[PDB]
Each structure stands twice: as C-alpha cells, then as structure tokens.
UniProtKB/TrEMBL annotation, chain A:
The gene is rplM. Transmembrane segments: none annotated. GO terms for biological process: negative regulation of translation; translation. The keyword Ribonucleoprotein applies. GO terms for molecular function: mRNA binding; structural constituent of ribosome. Keywords: Ribonucleoprotein, Ribosomal protein. GO terms for cellular component: cytosolic large ribosomal subunit. Belongs to the universal ribosomal protein uL13 family. Pfam families: Ribosomal_L13 (PF00572). SUPFAM superfamilies: Ribosomal protein L13 (SSF52161). This is Large ribosomal subunit protein uL13.
From TrEMBL, chain B:
The keyword S-adenosyl-L-methionine does not apply. Pfam families: Ribosomal_L22 (PF00237). Belongs to the universal ribosomal protein uL22 family. This is Large ribosomal subunit protein uL22. Signal peptide: none annotated. GO terms for cellular component: cytosolic large ribosomal subunit. GO terms for molecular function: rRNA binding; structural constituent of ribosome. It comes from Flavobacterium johnsoniae. GO terms for biological process: translation. The globular domain of the protein is located near the polypeptide exit tunnel on the outside of the subunit, while an extended beta-hairpin is found that lines the wall of the exit tunnel in the center of the 70S ribosome. This protein binds specifically to 23S rRNA; its binding is stimulated by other ribosomal proteins, e.g., L4, L17, and L20. It is important during the early stages of 50S assembly. It makes multiple contacts with different domains of the 23S rRNA in the assembled 50S subunit and ribosome. The lineage of its organism: Bacteria, Pseudomonadati, Bacteroidota, Flavobacteriia, Flavobacteriales. Keywords: Ribonucleoprotein, Ribosomal protein, RNA-binding, rRNA-binding. The keyword Ribosomal protein applies.
UniProtKB/TrEMBL annotation, chain D:
It comes from the Bacteria. Keywords: Ribonucleoprotein, Ribosomal protein, RNA-binding, rRNA-binding. The gene is rplT. This is Large ribosomal subunit protein bL20. The lineage of its organism: Bacteria, Pseudomonadati, Bacteroidota, Flavobacteriia, Flavobacteriales. One of its GO terms (biological process) is ribosomal large subunit assembly. GO terms for cellular component: ribonucleoprotein complex; ribosome. The keyword Ribonucleoprotein applies. Belongs to the bacterial ribosomal protein bL20 family. GO terms for molecular function: rRNA binding; structural constituent of ribosome. Binds directly to 23S ribosomal RNA and is necessary for the in vitro assembly process of the 50S ribosomal subunit. It is not involved in the protein synthesizing functions of that subunit. The keyword Ribosomal protein applies.
Automatic annotation (TrEMBL), chain F:
Residues 1-24 are annotated as: Disordered. One of its GO terms (molecular function) is structural constituent of ribosome. Belongs to the universal ribosomal protein uL4 family. This is Large ribosomal subunit protein uL4. One of its GO terms (biological process) is translation. Keywords: Ribonucleoprotein, Ribosomal protein, RNA-binding, rRNA-binding. One of its GO terms (cellular component) is ribonucleoprotein complex. Forms part of the polypeptide exit tunnel. One of the primary rRNA binding proteins, this protein initially binds near the 5'-end of the 23S rRNA. It is important during the early stages of 50S assembly. It makes multiple contacts with different domains of the 23S rRNA in the assembled 50S subunit and ribosome. It comes from the Bacteria. Part of the 50S ribosomal subunit.
Length: 150, 128, 150, 113, 64, 154
RNA sequence: AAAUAAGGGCGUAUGGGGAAUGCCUAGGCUCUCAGAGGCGAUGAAGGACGUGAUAAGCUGCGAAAAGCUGCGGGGACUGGCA
RNA sequence: GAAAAGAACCGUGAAUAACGGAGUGAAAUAGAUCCUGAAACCAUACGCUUACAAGCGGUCGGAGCCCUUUCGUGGGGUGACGGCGUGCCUUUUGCAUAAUGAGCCUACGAGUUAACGCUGCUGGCAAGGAUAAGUACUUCAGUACGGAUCCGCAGCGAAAGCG
RNA sequence: AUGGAUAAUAAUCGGGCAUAAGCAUAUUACCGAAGCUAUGGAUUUGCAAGUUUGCAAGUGGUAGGGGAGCAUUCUAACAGGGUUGAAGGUUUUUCGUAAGGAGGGCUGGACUGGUUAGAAAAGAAAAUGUAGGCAUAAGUAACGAUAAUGCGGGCGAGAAAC
C-alpha cells in the first residue's frame, strides 16, 4: 500500500543534463587519466547519480597522440586478440598499436573500467577519442576540464 | 439468474452473420495455413484465393464462405450485397475429436495413428 | 447440561490428529520415524526378545536351578494387626472362625488360613484356624482366649 | 466412512499457482513446475530484503560523496567532521539534501567545516 | 493373543520380592578343581540381574 | 490384497522390459487392486464400571432437578389409545412444543400407544431408563409409582 | 474498412478438447431375526436347435413351442423388453 | 429433458456433410459425443514490450505507456535499464553435478485393526477393586442379576518348612 | 631485487592498469555482515498480579523427541439457510503465525450446513508407481520388391488409380 512515505528520488532520462567535457591528455599517464575519464563518463560527480540511468557527460580526449607510459611499457605491453580459429592467438605491442590509430590506446584503457553491461556499452558511445588536437563536433560548445581539479 | 433472461440477452446473433463447419476430416494444422491467407481479406479476394489455392483444404473452405455470404444476405434482407463491401472479420480453425487406429510396426509392436478433425468458424462483418 | 454442551475433564482428551508420514511440517515425515536404511527400518521388523546380536544371551548363559513341589501347601496369611483392626470396627465378637474369614473377604471358600504374628492384638478372641505361628499363638493365648487348630 | 479431499485438494494449489502469474513458459499453469518456482521465488524474496537495506546505503553514500566533492572535500573527511560535530543526520536525509537542496547541503558543509 | 512366557527364561530368573530378578552364577560346572575356593565361594550365592539386562529379562518373563 | 478376484501371476518379466517391476495384479497401487488398510467389521463397545454408570445416571437426574424440569403425575390410565387425548393432556402440564419424557412405573400399553406417534414426547418405563434418555428430553414427568423404583435402585 | 515486428513474451476475453469435481441411482458389501439345505432313469445341472400378424438380439416356452387346462383372488384393459 | 414435445418447413451447399433461420421448452451455449462441466493441450481479438544482445528465466530497485478510481505517500497490466542469484527429490564425509528419478494434467496410492501388556494425563471406588459366560424383563444388534474367577493386602528358601 | 628450461584448445595480479595504485613502519578518517544497537511486533520457559499484563533468560537446525491446531467424509443434540437461487466451476476483496475462514460478480439449477462431542477408507511432487486424456520430436520417418505406363471417350458435383 506504499507504506514508505519518504522515498529516495532517482533521476530519469527526462531530468538528466549531459555536458560535453573536453580533456587534454598532453601530460598524463594512461591509467591515471583513464580512471578519471571513466568516472566522468559513468557520472559520479553529480549529487543525482542513479546507477541504472545513463547519467554523466560526454568526454572528448583531444591529445591522445601525446600520451605516455611510465616504465618500458611502450615496449613491453602486449595485447592479445584471439580470433577463434585453432592457433589464432595474436599478440600486439604498445609500440606497434600506437603506430596505427594511436587513439586505440586510450580507447582500450577506458573500455575495461566500465560496468561491462548494456549500460556500459552505451556509455562507450559517449567517449570521443581524437588523435589530433581539434575535434569535429563544432556546434556543441564544449568546455575544457582539467582532471587535476576533481 | 434467470436462464431464459440470460438466453434472451445472449441471443444477439440476429445482426452478426457467421458460418460454421464442424466435423471436417482434415487436420487443423493444414487448414490454419490457408486460413491465414484469407483472414482480413475482402469477400471476393478471399474467394479467388480459396478457388486458386494449391491445397486440398480449400475445396470445402471456399463454400463455407459462400454459405456465410448467403447467411448475411438472409439476415440483411433489405439491401443489396455489393454496396456493403463484406470482408472476413475473424476466422478460427479449432481442433476436433480424433480417431485412434493401430499400425503394426516391425518386431511385434504397434504404433498409434490419430486421424484428426477440425472445426472452422467464420464471421463476415461489413464496411458500409 | 445438555447433549450440545458436553465437555470432558480438562486433560482427558488429546490430539488424535497425530499420523506418521504426512509431509514435512508435522514432524514425522519423509523417513517416517525409523531413520535411514537398516534392518530396523524395513516393513515387518520385529525385535527378537532373547536375541543379543549373535552372542550367547543371558537367558542362555545362566544355569537352571530348583524344582517345583507337586504337593505345595500355601496358606493365606492373616496378621494380628488385621485381626485387631477387624475387631475394632465391630464385625466379629469373641469368635473368629472360618466363616468370618469368608464374610470379610479374607480367604476364599476352600482354602487354608494361617494366623501370623505381625501386630499388637489386645482383645480376647477364640480363633479357629488351620495353622499358627510361634508368635501368633503366644500372643493370642496370653492376651486372650484359646486358639484352636482345625 | 470414505473421505475424499477432492475440492480442497485443488483449491489449495489454485492459491499457490495464482501467484505464479507472469512466469515464462509452463511455469505459470503447470502445477509441478509452478510450485517449484513459487517456493524459489519466496526464497529469493526472503533474502534481497537484507540486501535492499545495504544497496540503498551505498547509493546514499555515493550521492553524499558526489555532493561533497563539489566543495573541494571528500566523503571520508566530510563524514568525520560531521560525526565529530554533534549533528546526527542519517545518510538518507543527507543524500536527499545533497540532491534536492544544494543550498542546505552547502550550509551544513560550511557549518561543519 | 495372550503373550507366551519364554521357557528358557521362566526356568531361570526367579523374581524377587519387590522389583528385582534373582538368578544363579556360571562357571561352576565341571572344572572346579583348579579354581580357587574364593571364586567358588563367591559364585555359589545367588545374584541379581543387572539393570542393563533387566529390560530384556522382563520382556522375556512377560512383565513389560 | 488377498480377497481380490484375480490371479497371483507375474505380469511382466523382472528385467529387460524398461518399465517398473510389478506382478500379482491384486496389488493396491494398481487400478482394481485391494484396498490397503481399509475398514474391517468391528465392535465399538467398551466397558464402564456399573458404579460410574449409576453415578452418571444420578447426575443426569440432579441436572434436571437443578434446572427445574421435573413434574409428578398421579399415574393416570387411558381406556382406549388416543393420540388426541394424549395431546389434550399436555397443555395442563405446559409441555406443548417441548420435549417431554414420561417415566412410567408399569407397562401402560394404552398410554404408550397414545404417544408412539408424537415426536415431542416419549414414554419410557423405569426398567429401561438411561443417562442418554434422561439428557435427551427437556422435561421429565415421573409418575407416582415410578419414583419408588427410581430411588431404591441407585 | 482498419491495423501490421517476419515472429516471440506477458495480461484479459471468447472458443475447441477432455473428462475430473458436485448431485443422483439401476448395482454392490457386511450383517440381524426366522426357515430350508438338494436335483436326477416318470431322464438332472449345462447346452444345441426351433417357436411371433411383423422378429436381429434378450426374456419366456418346446412340434400342444411369448403358450394349454382346473381351483381360488381380481374387475378394464390386453397381445414381454417394443 | 418434467413429459421426446428428438428440430415440420426455408436457404447455401452435389449432398438426408455441415451450418444459418423457423417452430418445442424454463433453458438447444439442455440437439442425441446431449445435467454441471475444471486441468493438461490447441487457436483468435485487444493493451504493453521485443531484431548489438549471452546462462535455473526469478527477486529487489526503476522510468515510460495503457485501464480504474472513495481521488490516492490508491489499485490492475506491460515493463526499457541496474544489483543478487548454478531447479527439486533420494543416497551420501561431501551433488549444479556429467550419481538416481520424473513428458504434462486429472483420478487412485503406502504406520490400519484384533488379542494380550507397559508408560503419561484423566475418572470411579478404596484395604479393597472388578466382573466373564450366562439369566430375567422390555418399546429388543439397545436395566437388574450373575463373585466362577483375577489383582492387591507378607516375604524367604531348590524344597521340606518357617514367617 | 637478479640468473638458475619448459607441455601440449588462448592467456592472466580476477580485469583495466599502476613506477606507485609495489614493499617495510607509524598515525588519522571512512567503507564494511542476518554481529551489536535504535523502533514496531510475535512466541517459549521461570517469577508475581489476576482470570491478560509486568520482569529475566532465550527463540539456526538433519536423525529424532514433545505441545497446540486446520481442512476432508459421516454421526448425536440445539439452532439454521435455499428455485427471491444449494452444492460445484471462474474471477475479486478482506481476516489469521500458518494449515485456512468470510463476503461480492458471472456460469449452475437442488441441496446444504453453524456450535459442542465422537469416529476415520482423514491431506502427494517424486515409488524406471497404475488408468484415462493430451503435447514434443513434426507436418519429420514412412506410404511395404526399380514389371511401366500414355492418350481418347462414359457415368459423375468432383477421375493419375473406376
């Protein structure tokens, strides 16, 4: 009979407000930036976060070509890409992978810190990883956010 | 409740025109194939489809529709038939009482064979 | 009061609904009351009384002893205490014969009575019995009349 | 006399099957499949009631953390300074304030900070 | 019908005055020349059925 | 299982059939088998001490005496059996539409026949009284002559 | 005429299917009281074949064949199930 | 079906296959598969969802959309999305186990009775307690009488015996 | 910390990944269970008042032991209901710790049942259990010697088979 009389209001799709955050990845470590990017994408810096709603902002990383790894990880980081056929386990390297589409580094770093669900596959579509220094969104008026102010 | 009152209230079939085909020695799964092509069509397109269908389940279904048309003409005596523009509102193919026979399988055993029947019901409705 | 208000004493009636093997929830269900498998859980099990598992029972490890006399004469046994308690509540006066023993349910019709000497008989009586004891005769002949053997 | 429990035998299972309304497949009409599904549903309903009380506290804590990190603070420090100040407001009310009344939330934060 | 009394138990196991069962001792049959006179004197007096066997002896004697 | 009209023959083989093992068609879990643990011809009479029985019969009289449902007549006699006359003498006592038990001291066949047809009146001699008979009625009518036998028998 | 996601899931309503349940009895079960405890060479029990204005079965009856005679009861319908 | 009053007659149809009418009845959705007639099972209409999304199919949260409304921190239906979650029985130290068993529904189906005893509660009488077979009367498978006999009141000893 | 070979379906700190988000010591705040506490309610023993209340200790549970009860069929008494609609079937509301009770709408067209006491053919989800009905496999296997059929007329509503 709805005997609660005091409920916790959860945000809906008609009440959320998505922003267009732009993040500069010039001086930043891969995982150290990807953690904050994934937290912003999921949406947890708003005091209205509902776990089942696609809250949060849309992140545009604008310097992914200028990211760096700490140790000899650029030469000793391996990515496994098994295909499904017998003997089809392919291994890449962090140095070879950034030679073609360097945005894949940040893309695969962010994909993995997400809830791994339908909500979490729909959150990956809000992340735009640009290899250059200028995006192609244009008439959206995105604001720059420094990850050191969170 | 008074059963005569309930029956007099339920006897509202003086307007709806329908037709039934009971105890047809054909399986329902094979007539439900031709009922889907007729369901919702016009009263003449349905007749053409049933007359040119390559199924033995249509030879006795094409005249049930004619009987339904005749029942509609009987109920709506005052008025012609082509101005109304009849169609096939609803058509349902139900099951029926099946006969059970035996077939001698190899090595001294017997299998069962069920000769199935089906009931067909059709209502016309009008566009006007 | 009436045939529609019959009520027995509190505690004379009981459950009468207790049946064994009527589902889990009434107690005895499933393996009804016999635990798990074994000879004591099979239909038709009966405990062999003398059986001791396979070894020699006590009713067979102990020797037999004694015999039975065919001419055993067993007397009834009446005490001076009972005689005095019977003479206090006046039913017998100055003569206790073999008839006052049957009229007071002390001996059967055709039996033999022996007067024992457990009591403190004080009244003067003239008893007629089959046998006497060294205490009963000495306590009767000294504290009252005679004691004749019949 | 011969006693047959024919009517109540089925009246008892109708009531247990009427709560398996909306189940996929034969779990809603077949008796020996519905009874096996209603009991497991009640077993699942007994629990998740202890979990509804700790899944909402997590949401309250997350919302309080989000509302407190907007003022350059953290949930741990905020809760420490609130508990060692004589306030005694539960996380439900604190999250409701952080979500609906940001002015009241920041007033509480400035008072305890 | 009526419970029958076991003869093997009725020939032994004389019941005492109030609640006990009196029986005899064993081992005093045919090898008495090498046993000490102390054992033969102890095994001569009648004994009582132990409380662990009393239930079985009473079930045999038909005193449940 | 033993009285069923059938035959004690194994239906199917023990093994190699694929179905449940069975035989002796008269078994209870088959259609037409014997009723296991069914009813039997019995006797439901138990023993009560004739002291407790007369104590109960005395309590049944004391209950009516306390409830004030005891009348005493003068041992009337009817020439011919007449239900009309027997009903005529029920309003002088006030037992109309009430359950009455007339306890006679003697046969009085005419008085018994004059009430054999009524359901609200029962004529019973003192040599056949019972606790149930006393408790069933709503008003006892002890004729003068039956009390001498009721009192000196308990 | 309308609708249309090729199809599926859930809820409601209306149908076919089936025979459960409820009610009833034509039939059975255990007995009480009082009798009786056999039929057959004057041809038994059990059958076969026949018998009708009309006659496939059941019932009855035997070439005198759904029947014959005598003594009593009975008083308007009858030619068995039909 | 109370009683055949068991559907004369008309139309579609090749058709005395079936149906729609018309008459009988209180009822024909009581039409001879005939009283009421459920479940498994097979279909149609309507409302909500579903073609980038992996698992005992439920449970706890949760928008949106349809009906109702004492008007509601009321009810009903469907539910996009999130968290948790490897059916049941039996046998086992231990089973999601790839150990057993069941295609589903309806009906049947397994600690009952007699005789002789023992414990717990209750009742009558009380150093006494109780009748059995049977008999008499009667309004008859249902008050009186019947003390034969059984248990207890004294035990010990193999027994005579003593008490 | 470093070198001291490794196993056969693609692998591992659980994964992303981390140069600290590793390790060693010390401190503070916080998270964290059906543990403890706060609120409401129910129940078992022991102690008192009475004729339910108060306090204390409890309240996981297999084999197993004990105590209170529900439904079903029938019977004995008192009191009832029903063609102005009984039992039964289908939905809905409400009450109880539960077994279950009561009320309303629809079908149904004759029985039913309260209180106290009694009796038992007194409750199924499994026994490769029994009988009847109905699904799945599925419109799938098969339509029973590879000696063979084609055309034109006839009856007929309808012909590859007459």
């Amino acid at each position: 009979m709805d005997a609660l009389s005091y409920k916790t209001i959860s945000a809906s799709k008609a009440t959320v407000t998505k922003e267009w955050i732009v993040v500069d990845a010039e001086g930043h470590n891969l995982g150290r930036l990807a953690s904050k990017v994934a937290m912003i994408l999921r949406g947890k810096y708003k005091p209205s976060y509902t776990p089942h709603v696609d809250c949060g902002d849309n992140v545009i990383v604008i310097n992914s070509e200028k990211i760096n790894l700490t140790g000899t990880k650029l030469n000793d980081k391996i990515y496994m890409r098994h295909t499904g056929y017998p003997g089809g386990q392919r291994t890449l390297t962090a140095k070879v992978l950034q030679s073609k589409n360097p945005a894949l580094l940040v893309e695969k770093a962010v994909k993995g810190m997400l809830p791994k669900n339908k909500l979490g596959a729909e959150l990956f579509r809000n992340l735009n990883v640009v290899v250059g220094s200028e995006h192609t969104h244009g008439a959206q008026k995105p604001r720059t956010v420094n990850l050191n102010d969170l | 409740r008074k059963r005569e009152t309930a029956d007099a209230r339920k006897e509202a079939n003086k307007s709806i025109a329908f037709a039934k085909l009971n105890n047809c020695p054909t399986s329902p799964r094979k007539m439900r194939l031709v009922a889907d092509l007729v369901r919702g069509q016009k009263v003449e397109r349905a007749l053409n489809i049933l007359r040119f269908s390559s199924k033995e389940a249509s030879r006795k279904l094409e005249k049930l529709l004619l009987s339904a048309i005749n029942n509609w003409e009987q109920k709506n005596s005052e008025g012609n038939l082509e101005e109304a523009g009849l169609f096939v509102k609803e058509i349902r193919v139900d099951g029926g009482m099946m006969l059970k026979r035996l077939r001698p399988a190899p090595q001294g055993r017997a299998h069962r064979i069920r000769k199935r029947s089906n009931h067909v019901t059709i209502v016309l409705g009008a566009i006007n | 009061m009436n045939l529609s208000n019959l009520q027995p004493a509190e505690g004379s009636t009981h459950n009468q609904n207790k049946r064994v093997g009527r589902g889990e929830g009434s107690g005895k269900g499933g393996t009804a009351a016999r635990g798990h498998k074994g000879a004591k859980s099979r239909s038709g099990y009966s405990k062999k009384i003398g059986f001791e598992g396979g070894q020699m029972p006590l009713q067979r490890r102990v020797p037999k002893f004694g015999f039975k006399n065919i001419n055993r004469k067993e007397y009834e046994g009446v005490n001076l205490d009972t005689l005095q308690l019977l003479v206090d509540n006046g039913v017998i006066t100055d003569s206790v014969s073999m008839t006052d023993f049957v009229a007071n349910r002390l001996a059967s019709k055709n039996e033999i009575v022996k007067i024992l000497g457990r009591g403190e008989l004080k009244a003067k009586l003239k008893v007629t019995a089959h046998k006497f004891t060294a205490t009963a005769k000495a306590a009767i002949e000294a504290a009252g009349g005679e004691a004749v053997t019949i | 006399p011969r006693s047959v429990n024919s009517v109540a035998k089925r009246a008892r299972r109708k009531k247990i099957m009427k709560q398996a309304k909306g189940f996929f497949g034969r779990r809603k009409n077949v008796w020996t499949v519905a009874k096996n599904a209603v009991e497991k549903a009640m077993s699942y309903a007994y629990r998740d009631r202890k979990q509804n009380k700790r899944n909402f506290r997590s949401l309250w804590i997350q919302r309080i953390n989000a509302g407190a990190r907007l003022e350059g603070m953290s949930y741990s420090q905020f809760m420490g300074k609130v508990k060692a100040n004589g306030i005694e407001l539960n996380r439900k009310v604190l999250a409701d304030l952080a979500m609906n009344h940001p002015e009241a939330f920041k007033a509480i934060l400035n008072k305890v900070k | 019908p009526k419970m029958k009394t076991k003869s093997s138990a009725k020939k032994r196991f004389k019941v005492t005055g109030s609640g006990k069962i009196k029986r005899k001792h064993a081992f005093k049959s045919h090898i008495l020349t090498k046993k000490s006179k102390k054992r033969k004197l102890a095994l001569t007096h009648s004994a009582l059925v132990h409380k662990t066997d009393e239930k079985s002896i009473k079930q045999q004697l038909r005193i449940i | 299982r033993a009285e069923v009209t059938g035959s004690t023959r194994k239906i199917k083989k023990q093994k190699g059939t694929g179905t449940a093992r069975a035989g002796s068609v008269k078994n209870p879990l088959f259609k037409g088998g014997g009723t296991v643990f069914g009813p039997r011809p019995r006797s439901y009479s138990f023993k009560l001490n004739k002291n407790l029985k007369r104590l109960a019969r005395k309590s049944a009289f004391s209950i009516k005496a306390k409830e004030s449902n005891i009348i005493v007549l003068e041992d009337f006699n009817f020439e011919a059996p007449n239900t009309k006359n027997f009903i005529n003498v029920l309003k002088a006592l006030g037992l109309e539409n009430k359950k009455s038990l007339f306890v006679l001291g003697e046969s009085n066949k005419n008085v018994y026949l004059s009430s054999r047809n009524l359901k609200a009146s029962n004529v019973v001699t003192s040599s056949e009284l019972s606790t149930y008979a006393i408790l069933n009625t709503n008003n006892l009518v002890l004729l003068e002559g039956s009390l001498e036998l009721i009192e000196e028998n308990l």
